[PDB]
Amino acid sequence: VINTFDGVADYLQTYHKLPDNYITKSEAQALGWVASKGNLADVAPGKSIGGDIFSNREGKLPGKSGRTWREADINYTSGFRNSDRILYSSDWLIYKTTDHYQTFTKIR
């Protein structure tokens, strides 16, 4: 399981995909995840949420025609989700947030 800022950031820039321990919220829901119960580890042990599109509505991340931003949870192990996310563009800019998408800083 690769779920560290550095680990995932490097994996993404190289292989251009998230490591196989990631699933989208959609996928997780189909497996019986209930966000309000914090039960993701019960129904999908070893998995973390990640790969969903991030809408960047506050336009805090640098925009660009054709550029798409996605997110993945970092440091998740069990229970309710934390506030740590990796944000990555289709042109492999990598940003991080530890404060629920309020502030972002570049890590690659």
Enzyme catalytic residues: 71, 100
Q: Tell me how long the chain is.
A: 108
Strands 22-23 and 48-53: parallel
Helices assigned H by DSSP within the chain: 5-15, 25-30, 40-43
Residue 26 to residue 33: CA distance in whole angstroms: 9
